[PDB]
Amino acid sequence: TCPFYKKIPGTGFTVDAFQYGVVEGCTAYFLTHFHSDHYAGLSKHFTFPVYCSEITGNLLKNKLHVQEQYIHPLPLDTECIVNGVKVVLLDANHCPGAVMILFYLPNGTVILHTGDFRADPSMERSLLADQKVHMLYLDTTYCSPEYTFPSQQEVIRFAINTAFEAVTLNPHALVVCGTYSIGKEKVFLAIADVLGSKVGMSQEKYKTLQCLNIPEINSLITTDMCSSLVHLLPMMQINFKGLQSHLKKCGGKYNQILAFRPTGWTHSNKFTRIADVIPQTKGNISIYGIPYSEHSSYLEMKRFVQWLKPQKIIPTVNVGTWKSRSTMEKYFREWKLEAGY
Ligand code: NI
């Protein structure tokens, strides 16, 4: 049974609701992005209309095999009519293909569903500037003031400088970056660019990257591991055992590994500056955890919401405990009293 926060009142629409069977009354199923918790339930046997971005549609067709006739891609920043209701898709600043959805209801109510997003001041000059939002369905992943992390640009600066230093000192070092989903591609692309290398990976991952409309991608990535000194591996292999095992396979080409684990927030954020981050080291293997987030910090979220001034907020993350729900409602009321809406 579909929960309330995935239904859009006054429409036949649902958002990120594929794991509940046939939802009674649903005429169109929206998918905000290609992350497994959100697409859970879609497969090649699905026979209802799916609305999404072009990139998300490339992934549904090639990776999940959903048939073409049920894929409905929409351009961004463009007023579209779906089943008699005006909608707009906006870039969510999450992973490739991720959108927010603006619904203009036939009674005059305007609803924004953020999907998963990393709020940014640039969103204050999208099509959202133009009009009022009555209801906001909000990605509250990091809705508590302890959740702090740096900008994506600072994190990439640390990674590029760390990798370039290590490989310049030791031309025989290999760099490895962990992945388990789409998103965070800038980590491995920026490191490979400073090193003058293509990124090497499995056939399955190459396939996924080829769906993403990244400019000049054929110049940046490869399945030929031997030619590359930046390799991608599944996130589960980013540990001393997994990496030892990988270096064996490289046939005495390398004598050292430097690896990166992009995480979201971790408690070491509450003490340590990005500058001060140190690795875990065993022998000729070092592993850096780096806090590259594709979700809003507390401060970025609060800024966005205070600027938008919605009349009602419905959280979509951390909704399963009474303490979480109560905590989030308190911050929404502070924000409203502080800003005066
Ligand atoms: Ni996501």
Side-chain angles (χ1 to χ4, degrees), residues 1-23 25-203 205-215 217-240 242-247 249-269 271-281 283-311 313-341:
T1 60
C2 186
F4 73 99
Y5 74 83
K6 302 178 172 278
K7 287 178 171 163
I8 305 297
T11 65
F13 300 155
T14 54
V15 179
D16 299 346
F18 298 91
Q19 65 172 293
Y20 305 108
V22 177
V23 179
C26 191
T27 59
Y29 296 76
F30 286 79
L31 185 54
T32 63
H33 69 296
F34 195 78
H35 278 164
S36 66
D37 280 358
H38 296 259
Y39 65 71
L42 265 168
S43 72
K44 62 138 70 163
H45 305 303
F46 200 85
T47 52
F48 297 94
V50 180
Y51 285 81
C52 60
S53 68
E54 180 188 349
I55 288 162
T56 295
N58 296 338
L59 295 155
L60 292 179
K61 177 187 162 173
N62 292 285
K63 297 294 293 193
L64 289 183
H65 302 286
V66 173
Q67 308 165 41
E68 197 140 279
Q69 74 179 138
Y70 306 112
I71 310 171
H72 294 264
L74 304 175
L76 303 180
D77 305 317
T78 301
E79 295 184 329
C80 290
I81 308 305
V82 179
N83 295 354
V85 180
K86 175 163 75 163
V87 306
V88 174
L89 298 190
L90 310 162
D91 205 287
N93 189 41
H94 185 50
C95 67
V99 303
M100 315 192 288
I101 311 159
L102 250 194
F103 300 94
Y104 291 85
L105 259 51
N107 63 25
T109 299
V110 179
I111 291 174
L112 177 62
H113 198 300
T114 64
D116 280 348
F117 87 139
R118 182 160 184 180
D120 193 74
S122 64
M123 298 172 174
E124 303 169 20
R125 300 168 280 282
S126 62
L127 304 192
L128 292 176
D130 304 43
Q131 99 289 279
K132 181 184 180 57
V133 172
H134 301 81
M135 314 201 80
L136 178 62
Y137 286 69
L138 176 64
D139 168 15
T140 45
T141 296
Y142 296 128
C143 188
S144 191
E146 71 271 23
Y147 297 119
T148 60
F149 35 73
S151 67
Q152 290 179 168
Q153 196 281 326
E154 288 176 79
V155 175
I156 288 304
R157 175 93 289 187
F158 173 84
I160 286 166
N161 286 356
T162 301
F164 180 73
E165 175 174 321
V167 166
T168 303
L169 294 171
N170 182 194
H172 302 280
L174 177 62
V175 180
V176 182
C177 294
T179 186
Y180 45 29
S181 58
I182 67 171
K184 310 188 189 187
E185 287 78 15
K186 189 67 170 177
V187 178
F188 56 82
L189 298 170
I191 290 169
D193 170 272
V194 80
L195 298 180
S197 181
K198 294 191 177 180
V199 187
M201 61 196 64
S202 71
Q203 285 186 263
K205 186 75 192 181
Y206 183 92
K207 181 173 185 191
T208 299
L209 298 182
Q210 282 292 158
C211 300
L212 311 182
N213 294 345
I214 289 172
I217 191 59
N218 297 322
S219 66
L220 311 170
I221 62 173
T222 184
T223 49
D224 181 9
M225 308 296 279
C226 285
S227 76
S228 149
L229 62 135
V230 179
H231 295 173
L232 305 190
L233 284 182
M235 199 74 87
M236 288 196 76
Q237 205 170 350
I238 308 310
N239 47 69
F240 299 120
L243 294 166
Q244 282 164 191
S245 180
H246 187 73
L247 185 56
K249 293 158 219 148
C250 294
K253 206 160 196 306
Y254 308 109
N255 58 18
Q256 182 189 347
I257 286 176
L258 177 103
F260 296 90
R261 291 184 341 84
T263 64
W265 174 91
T266 67
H267 192 52
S268 30
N269 273 269
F271 305 125
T272 328
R273 270 169 151 62
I274 184 58
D276 301 328
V277 163
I278 65 158
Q280 283 191 210
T281 297
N284 61 348
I285 309 187
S286 290
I287 306 168
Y288 285 89
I290 61 175
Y292 193 91
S293 183
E294 292 184 342
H295 295 274
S296 312
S297 75
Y298 173 83
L299 290 166
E300 287 164 356
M301 192 190 301
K302 178 176 179 278
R303 176 179 169 123
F304 179 78
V305 176
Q306 288 183 312
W307 168 83
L308 193 70
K309 301 180 173 45
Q311 284 177 12
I313 304 178
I314 303 168
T316 63
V317 187
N318 307 308
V319 303
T321 77
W322 298 112
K323 186 179 177 210
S324 286
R325 291 185 142 299
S326 190
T327 291
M328 291 182 296
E329 290 172 355
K330 277 165 44 259
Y331 286 128
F332 309 149
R333 180 66 60 180
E334 289 176 12
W335 300 351
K336 183 185 161 78
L337 293 165
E338 182 189 17
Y341 57 98

